């Protein structure tokens, strides 16, 4: 009543269904990490420590039996709006900020004040309608650069309203403190900070802890508790 | 006269609230939400075990409302079997929900690839199978006896009734009380420690309030299980040890201790479905 | 430097023949009414020839 | 200097368009019978995707379609009996477009990987193997439509469309002129012209042979997310984000119809026309699909039943199906 062609079609679609199911089960354990950051931030440096096309750059690395996928968007330069909803469920963001550009003036704008531009980028990523529940990790990359930059230069170029110290520790604490309150929704969204510059597996350990915390939150949401 | 009225009334009210809870839970978990997640599968299995377990309450109410039990013998066998089967499976799924939550919180990497719907399905059908592994001897040893001019449902053993009764009472006291309590306390205590030590529940007033109410509902579940399962086991152990004289107070206390387990079985749907926020969202849409 | 090529592109777009909106909309309406019998969406065909039916 | 000349030439174009407009489409269609309260039911519920679908394309045989979702799987769907003929593992997990050739021997996919992959369907070994890897865009691909079996036209994020020769992998024509990110293109029924829409709310029609841009239509406000020709090839309709679908004319060069509602504030991400052309179905963003009578600008039906955004929409070439995709891994076909 069905002959060989319908049996072949049924078996073909069954085999396609098993392949799709096993591929979706395999990729359900993957952790999505939307790496961000403007130019000369330190993204190329922090993708050099994970040793273990025109637009999107894909790198894969596993750590302690958990799989990470990294979606660098540095190639794409048209509109973040028209493909930022294409992620929609990334585990964590790996946003980077250079700390040495507190006093830097752009050579093409002459008034852009690069650190404030990073503030607008971080505020746009944090206060996005598509990214309102995901954790956002800060990798303030350049430590030694602004260390021997503030060894001689003041810190009131970026924040004239700030004068508590001129040394590394209080300046770094102040800029992280005023950077983490960019988050207008801290009730159910958490922002971490590592400060980078270890030449070790410390950045990997930091994103491992952040990812496991996000997975704990997801399991709480699945368990009908949180 | 009045005491039989109150015993029948408490069995009837416990049975009707049990069927109402474990049927409204069924209706919601079938029509509004589905069994996609592992927790929904576990809640559905718990609803099955609790609904079929408390259905035997009218049988005991006509066992002691006014006298004899003319229902039959094979009916007695299947009633004893489904009671000792479904309460056992309800206890087992109550344990494996706790093990699932401890796995979810304390081991997130393993909880990614362990809390699949297929794994939950095979685990709880294995739980029903392991309950059946002791439910078949229950069906084998069930019988109907005619003594004192009345019909009653005893449980016949072999010729040494003392030894078989001792082993069965130890097996139902250890594998249904002291093993659920120990595993549930260890798992939930480790879960509460990991929930206190996490970043998302600390550093703010609202997050600490959420942690406190999560610990509060965990304590409510464990405390309800303890307060509704301790007195019946102590009652049966000390009535096995010493000769308790028969009196009205003994009858009332014995029926309270029997009804406490069914009170646990009827409080499980309101403590495991209405407490979860997914069913709260399901109720909020209507 | 794109202002010049924008000007040439715009002036090439300007000098084209444009018919009246009434005639073109009448042509669109005529094409709609001339294929009304070939559209199963507007006029639902009976189930004897519908290719999507239950098993 | 020259900017004033450009502005006055735009003013002259606008004045000529207003003088060329003497009757709107709605005024002369008041005497035609409406299609009433049209109702369609989901005959097939295609399932098997495990991510967010973004594009689907029908076939000329009106039986096989293709669907592209975010999991990197390209599923070839048989609509009649709900079967999966093929599954293509894409190297790129990010796709916003997928193409199905009129010959049916080639299926294309593309997206944020800046590469227009072309897959061979009718190989001798039976399996689906990639044939030619197109490259040359510096932005995200967003639309690809097969002109014929050897020529494909694509739009991308580098503000330029492109006509391609498949056997050489080169752009024979680059359609520069968009001051914004072009996202959707549709080809004419006679496969000699095509019109696209960009983020600058402009609808620029082109020529395949020589590449010149003929007309532009800037009636919209936010952007253009979708586009689809009329069956006669003398009109098209455009999606947007300002809750408006607008019909545009090739010969008169104006805006004809405004498919807008008072309570609708969401965007439009897909438009397609029926075989007759009187029915324009738009995949909105308020978790439903809409029916727009293309000659009356009124809502005649609703293709609800979607729990997420209706990203893609396609009406088959013989009027026997309306297959719409959505963000919740479902494709459904209406009749
Ligand atoms: C007392 N203990 C130690 C139990 O473990 C018990 C079993 C008691 N069982 C109940 C039904 C019964 O009354 C009956 C007699 C005749 C008929 Cl026709 C029908 C039913 C005979 C006695 C239990 C404790 C508390 C509440 C309910 C049950 C139990 C719990 C869990 C798993 C297995 C067994
Ligand atoms: C094997 C013999 C001894 C006893 C059989 C009873 C057990 C194994 C049966 C009875 C009722 C059954 C359940 C009925 C319905 C469902 C819902 C479905 O979505 C998943 C399986 C599940 C949850 C079944 C699992 C198996 C089940 C618990
Ligand atoms: C968890 C809370 C309720 C504490 C647990 C209390 C337990 C241990 C109590 C509650 C009811 C009690 C019984 C109530 C009545 C009688 C009858 C009497 O002639 C002998 C003692 C005996 C048989 C009691 C034994 C102890 C008992 C089972
Ligand atoms: N001395 C010193 N150099 C640093 C530090 N952090 C980053 N760099 C340099 O910064 C460039 C990456 O920027 P890049 O252009 O690839 O970014 P991108 O957004 O395009 S990926 C690399 O050459 C780095 O040596 C630091 O602490 N100290």
From Swiss-Prot, chain A:
Result after altering residue 49 to P: In NEDHISB; loss of GTP binding
Residue ranges of the region described as G4 motif: 137-144
Keyword Nucleotide-binding attached: yes
Xref: SMART domains: G_alpha
Bilayer topology term: Peripheral membrane protein; Lipid-anchor
Coiled-coil regions listed: none
PROSITE patterns, alphabetized: G_ALPHA
EC annotation from Swiss-Prot or TrEMBL: 3.6.5.-
Chain intervals for the UniProt region annotation (G3 motif): 68-77
First-listed, main subcellular location of the protein, grouped into a coarse class: nucleus
Modified residues (Deamidated glutamine): 76
Subcellular location: Nucleus; Cytoplasm; Cell membrane; Cytoplasm, Cytoskeleton, Microtubule organizing center, Centrosome
PTM per Swiss-Prot/TrEMBL: (Microbial infection) Deamidated at Gln-76 by Photorhabdus asymbiotica toxin PAU_02230, blocking GTP hydrolysis of heterotrimeric GNAQ or GNA11 and G-alphai (GNAI1, GNAI2 or GNAI3) proteins, thereby activating RhoA.
Residues found modified as ADP-ribosylcysteine: 223
GO cellular component, one term: nucleolus
Residues that, per the record, bind GTP: 40-45, 72-76, 141-144, 198
Record field: catalytic activity: GTP + H2O = GDP + phosphate + H(+)
Gene Ontology terms for molecular function: adenylate cyclase inhibitor activity; adenylate cyclase regulator activity; D2 dopamine receptor binding; G protein activity; G protein-coupled receptor binding; G protein-coupled serotonin receptor binding; G-protein beta/gamma-subunit complex binding; GDP binding
Residue span, G-alpha domain: 29-226
Family per record: Belongs to the G-alpha family. G(i/o/t/z) subfamily.
PANTHER family per record: GTP-BINDING PROTEIN ALPHA SUBUNIT, GUANINE NUCLEOTIDE-BINDING PROTEIN G(I) SUBUNIT ALPHA-1
Name this protein carries in UniProt: Guanine nucleotide-binding protein G(i) subunit alpha-1
Organism: Homo sapiens
Biological classification of the source: Eukaryota, Metazoa, Chordata, Craniata, Vertebrata
From Swiss-Prot, chain B:
Topological type in the membrane: Multi-pass membrane protein
Post-translational modification comment from the UniProt entry: Phosphorylated. Differentially phosphorylated in basal and agonist-induced conditions. Agonist-mediated phosphorylation modulates receptor internalization. Phosphorylated by GRK2 in a agonist-dependent manner. Phosphorylation at Tyr-102 requires receptor activation, is dependent on non-receptor protein tyrosine kinase Src and results in a decrease in agonist efficacy by reducing G-protein coupling efficiency. Phosphorylated on tyrosine residues; the phosphorylation is involved in agonist-induced G-protein-independent receptor down-regulation.
Cytoplasmic topological domain: 28-40, 100-119, 190-213
Alphabetical GO biological process terms: adenylate cyclase-inhibiting G protein-coupled acetylcholine receptor signaling pathway; adenylate cyclase-inhibiting G protein-coupled receptor signaling pathway; behavioral response to ethanol; G protein-coupled opioid receptor signaling pathway; G protein-coupled receptor signaling pathway; G protein-coupled receptor signaling pathway, coupled to cyclic nucleotide second messenger; negative regulation of cell population proliferation; negative regulation of cytosolic calcium ion concentration
Protein location: Cell membrane; Cell projection, Axon; Perikaryon; Cell projection, Dendrite
Phenotype for residue 153 to A/S: Abolishes ligand binding
Modified residues (Phosphotyrosine): 102
Positions on the Extracellular side per record topology: 66-76, 142-164, 241-248
The organism's place on the tree of life at top rank: Eukaryota
UniProtKB/Swiss-Prot annotation, chain C:
Tissue-wise expression: Expressed in fetal tissues, including testis, adrenal gland, brain, white blood cells and brain.
Subcellular localization: Cell membrane
Coiled coil stretches, renumbered: none
GO cellular component: extracellular exosome; heterotrimeric G-protein complex; membrane; plasma membrane; synapse
Keywords: Acetylation, Cell membrane, Host-virus interaction, Lipoprotein, Membrane, Methylation, Prenylation, Transducer
GO biological process assignments: adenylate cyclase-activating dopamine receptor signaling pathway; cellular response to catecholamine stimulus; cellular response to prostaglandin E stimulus; fibroblast proliferation; G protein-coupled receptor signaling pathway
Example of a GO MF term: G-protein beta-subunit binding
Cysteines engaged in disulfide bonds, as pairs: none
Main location class: membrane
Keyword set includes Cell membrane: yes
Keyword hit for Lipoprotein: yes
Topology within the bilayer: Lipid-anchor
Top-level taxon: Eukaryota
UniProt function note: Guanine nucleotide-binding proteins (G proteins) are involved as a modulator or transducer in various transmembrane signaling systems. The beta and gamma chains are required for the GTPase activity, for replacement of GDP by GTP, and for G protein-effector interaction.
Similarity field: Belongs to the G protein gamma family.
Protein name: Guanine nucleotide-binding protein G(I)/G(S)/G(O) subunit gamma-2
Organism of origin: Homo sapiens
Organismal lineage: Eukaryota, Metazoa, Chordata, Craniata, Vertebrata
UniProtKB/Swiss-Prot annotation, chain D:
Coiled coil, from the record: none
Signal sequence extent: none
Disulfide bonds: none
Gene: GNB1
GO cellular component, one term: plasma membrane
Function text: Guanine nucleotide-binding proteins (G proteins) are involved as a modulator or transducer in various transmembrane signaling systems. The beta and gamma chains are required for the GTPase activity, for replacement of GDP by GTP, and for G protein-effector interaction.
Modified sites of kind Phosphohistidine: 261
Mutation effect (residue 75 to N): In MRD42; also found in patients with acute lymphoblastic T-cell leukemia; reduces interaction with GNAI2, GNAI3, GNA13 and GNA11; induces activation of PI3K-AKT-mTOR and MAPK pathways
Effect listed in the UniProt record for changing residue 89 to S: In MRD42; decreases receptor-driven G protein activation; decreases trimer formation with alpha and gamma subunit; no effect on protein abundance;no effect on complex formation with gamma subunit
Biological processes, Gene Ontology terms: adenylate cyclase-activating dopamine receptor signaling pathway; cell population proliferation; cellular response to catecholamine stimulus; cellular response to prostaglandin E stimulus; G protein-coupled acetylcholine receptor signaling pathway; G protein-coupled receptor signaling pathway; phospholipase C-activating G protein-coupled receptor signaling pathway; Ras protein signal transduction
Gene Ontology MF terms in the entry: GTPase activity; GTPase binding; protein-containing complex binding; signaling receptor complex adaptor activity
Pfam families xrefs: WD40_Gbeta
Cytoplasm found in the keyword field: no
The keyword Repeat belongs to this UniProt entry's keyword annotation: yes
Highest taxon of the lineage: Eukaryota
């Amino acid at each position: 009543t069905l002959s060989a062609e319908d049996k072949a079609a049924v078996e073909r679609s069954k085999m396609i269904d098993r392949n799709l199911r096993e591929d979706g089960e395999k990729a359900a354990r993957e952790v999505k990490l939307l790496l961000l950051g403007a130019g000369e931030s330190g993204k190329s440096t922090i993708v050099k420590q994970m040793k273990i096309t025109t637009g999107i750059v894909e790198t894969h690395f596993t750590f302690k039996d958990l799989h990470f996928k990294m979606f660098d968007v540095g190639g794409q330069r048209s509109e973040r709006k028209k493909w930022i909803h294409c992620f929609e469920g990334v585990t964590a963001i790996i946003f980077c900020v250079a700390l040495s550009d507190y006093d830097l003036v752009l050579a093409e704008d002459e008034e852009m004040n690069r650190m404030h531009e990073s503030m607008k980028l971080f505020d746009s990523i944090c206060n996005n309608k598509w990214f309102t529940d995901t954790s956002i990790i800060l990798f303030l990359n350049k430590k030694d650069l602004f260390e021997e930059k503030i060894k001689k230069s003041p810190l009131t170029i970026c924040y004239p309203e700030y004068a508590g110290s001129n040394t590394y520790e209080e300046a770094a604490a102040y800029i992280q403190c005023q950077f983490e309150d960019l988050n207008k929704r801290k009730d159910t969204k958490e922002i971490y900070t590592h400060f980078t510059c270890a030449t070790d597996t410390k950045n990997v350990q930091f994103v491992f802890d952040a990812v496991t915390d996000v997975i704990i939150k997801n399991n709480l949401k699945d368990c009908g508790l949180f | 006269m009045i005491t039989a009225i109150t015993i029948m009334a408490l069995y009837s009210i416990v049975c009707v609230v049990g069927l109402f809870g474990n049927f409204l839970v069924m209706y919601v978990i079938v029509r509004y939400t589905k069994m996609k997640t592992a927790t929904n599968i576990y809640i559905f299995n718990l609803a099955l075990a609790d609904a079929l377990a408390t259905s035997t309450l009218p049988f005991q109410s006509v066992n002691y409302l006014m006298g004899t039990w003319p229902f039959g013998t094979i009916l007695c066998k299947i009633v004893i079997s489904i009671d000792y089967y479904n309460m056992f499976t309800s206890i087992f799924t109550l344990c494996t929900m706790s093990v699932d939550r401890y796995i979810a919180v304390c081991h997130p990497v393993k909880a990614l690839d362990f809390r699949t719907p297929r794994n939950a399905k095979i685990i709880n059908v294995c739980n029903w199978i392991l309950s059946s592994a002791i439910g078949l001897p229950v069906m084998f040893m069930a019988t109907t006896k005619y003594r004192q001019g009345s019909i009653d449902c005893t449980l016949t053993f072999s010729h040494p009734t003392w030894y078989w009764e001792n082993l069965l009472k130890i097996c139902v006291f250890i594998f249904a009380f002291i093993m659920p309590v120990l595993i549930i306390t260890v798992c939930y205590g480790l879960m509460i420690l990991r929930l206190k030590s996490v970043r998302m529940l600390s550093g703010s007033k609202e997050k600490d309030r959420n942690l406190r109410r999560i610990t509060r509902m965990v304590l409510v579940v464990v405390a309800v299980f303890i307060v509704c399962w301790t007195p019946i086991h102590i009652y049966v152990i000390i009535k096995a040890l010493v000769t308790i004289p028969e009196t009205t107070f003994q009858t009332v206390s014995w029926h309270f201790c029997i009804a406490l387990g069914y009170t646990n079985s009827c409080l499980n749907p309101v403590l495991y479905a209405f407490l979860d926020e997914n069913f709260k969202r399901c109720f909020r849409e209507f | 430097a794109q202002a010049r090529k924008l000007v040439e592109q715009l002036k090439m777009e300007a000098n084209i023949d444009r018919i009246k909106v009434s005639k073109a909309a009448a042509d669109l309406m005529a094409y709609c009414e001339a294929h009304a019998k070939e559209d199963p969406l507007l006029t639902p065909v009976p189930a004897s020839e519908n290719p999507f039916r239950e098993k | 200097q020259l900017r004033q000349e450009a502005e006055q030439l735009k003013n002259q174009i606008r004045d000529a368009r207003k003088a060329c407009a003497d009757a709107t489409l709605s005024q002369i269609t008041n005497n035609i019978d409406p299609v009433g309260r049209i109702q369609m039911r989901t005959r097939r519920t295609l399932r098997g995707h495990l991510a967010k679908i973004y594009a689907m394309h029908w076939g000329t045989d009106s039986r096989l379609l293709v669907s592209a979702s975010q999991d990197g799987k390209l599923i070839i769907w048989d609509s009649y009996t709900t079967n999966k003929v093929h599954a293509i593992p894409l190297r790129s997990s990010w796709v916003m477009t997928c193409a199905y050739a009129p010959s049916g021997n080639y299926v294309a996919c593309g997206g944020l990987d800046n590469i227009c992959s072309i897959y061979n369907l009718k190989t001798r070994e039976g399996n689906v193997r990639v044939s030619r890897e197109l490259a040359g865009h510096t932005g995200y691909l967003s639309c690809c439509r097969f002109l014929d079996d050897n020529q494909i036209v694509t739009s991308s994020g580098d503000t330029t469309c492109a006509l391609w020769d498949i056997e050489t992998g080169q752009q024979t024509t680059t359609f520069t002129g968009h001051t914004g990110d072009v996202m959707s293109l549709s080809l004419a029924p006679d496969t000699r012209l095509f019109v696209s829409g960009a983020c600058d709310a402009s609808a620029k029609l082109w020529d395949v042979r020589e590449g010149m841009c003929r007309q532009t239509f800037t009636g919209h406000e936010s952007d253009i997310n979708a586009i689809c020709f009329f069956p006669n090839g003398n009109a098209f309709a455009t999606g947007s984000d300002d809750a408006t679908c607008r019909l545009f004319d090739l010969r008169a060069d104006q805006e004809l119809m405004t498919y807008s509602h008072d309570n609708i504030i969401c965007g439009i991400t897909s438009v397609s026309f029926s075989k007759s052309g009187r029915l324009l179905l738009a995949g909105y963003d308020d978790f439903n699909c809409n029916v727009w009578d293309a000659l009356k600008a009124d809502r005649a039906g609703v293709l609800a039943g979607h729990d997420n955004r209706v990203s893609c929409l396609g009406v088959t070439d013989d009027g026997m199906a309306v297959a719409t995709g959505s963000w919740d891994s479902f494709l459904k076909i209406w009749n």
